[PDB]
Amino acid sequence: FATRVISAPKVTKKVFFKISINGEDAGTIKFGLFGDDVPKTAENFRALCTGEKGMGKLGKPLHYKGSPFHRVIPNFMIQGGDITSGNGYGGESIYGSKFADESFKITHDGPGLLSMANSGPNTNGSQFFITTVPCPWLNGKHVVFGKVIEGMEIVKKIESLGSQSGTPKAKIIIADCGEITE
């Protein structure tokens, strides 16, 4: 019954983003979430791709659709998921408030990892980032909970529209998002 030998956590659920860059379709990015290892963090992110939880305490949809990549730093990461004020300071989780860091056991070992942006311990909302390099120094501070499984070429593309200050050089949007039931 045991069939393969993974050097990584198991992908429990799959979700996707569809990226628009300056109003133009830029492709899809597929993610696998580590629901066995960080379930509350994977579930939060998944229901934000569906919008299934409706309207948050802050008067916006609990829904990634329409949020920008508000901070893009080359040779580091791309970041978005501000679903309330949409400017990089907002964000809201599906748990009413910021929830605690689930686990620091999946580390920032290479590019293409999904991780929770925060403002300190137990401040996880909806802001995420995708690494584009190994970030061992974020270990113990940001909860890794998923990875890019298709479309890293597009993560690489959004990164190239960044700056070292991190201000984006184009309007990068999650034009649509959902779950891959299959």
DSSP output for 128-151: EEEESS--GGGTTTS-EEEEEEE-
* Cα–Cα distance measured from residue 122 to residue 100, given in angstroms and rounded to the nearest whole number: 4
Answer yes or no: are the C-beta atoms of 115 and 144 closer than 8 Å.
Answer: yes
CA 86 to chain centre: 15
Q: Which of helix, strand or coil describes residue 44?
A: helix
Beta bridge partners of 72: 78
* Cα–Cα distance measured from residue 57 to residue 69, given in angstroms and rounded to the nearest whole number: 23
Cβ-based neighbours of 68, under 8 Å, separated by 6 or more: 80, 82, 86, 168, 171, 172, 173, 174
Catalytic residue from among 34, 45, 79, 127: 79
Catalytic residue from among 46, 63, 108, 142: 142
Cβ-based neighbours of 137, under 8 Å, separated by 6 or more: 108
Catalytic residue from among 17, 31, 128, 129: 129
Catalytic residue from among 76, 99, 128, 145: 76
Helix ranges, the chain (H): 39-50, 152-160
**79 labelled catalytic:** yes
**104 labelled catalytic:** no
Counting every residue written for the chain, the total comes to 182
The experimental technique behind this entry is X-ray
Identify the CA nearest to 9 among candidates 175, 163, 149, 118.
149
SS3 content of the chain, % helix, strand, coil (to 5): 15, 30, 55
**76 labelled catalytic:** yes
Q: Is 25 exposed, middle or buried (0-12, 13-18, 19+ CB in 10 A)?
A: exposed
- Cα dist from 10 to 84, 118, 149, 150, whole Å: 31, 24, 12, 16
Q: Pull the structure tokens for residue 123.
A: 């401040």
The experimental resolution of this structure, in angstroms, equals 2.6
* Cα–Cα distance measured from residue 147 to residue 168, given in angstroms and rounded to the nearest whole number: 22
Catalytic residue from among 34, 71, 113, 127: 71
Which amino acid is it at 83? Answer: I
Cβ-based neighbours of 64, under 8 Å, separated by 6 or more: 17, 48, 49, 51, 81, 83, 126, 174, 177
> Which pairs from 59-63 meet CB under 8 Å and 24+ separation?
59/84, 60/84, 60/92, 62/92, 62/94, 62/126, 63/177
Catalytic residue from among 70, 138, 145, 161: 138
**71 labelled catalytic:** yes
* DSSP codes of every residue in 1-12: ------SS----
Question: Dihedral sign, CA of 121, 82, 136, 168?
Answer: negative
DSSP type of residue 92: -
Answer yes or no: are the C-beta atoms of 162 and 133 closer than 8 Å.
Answer: no
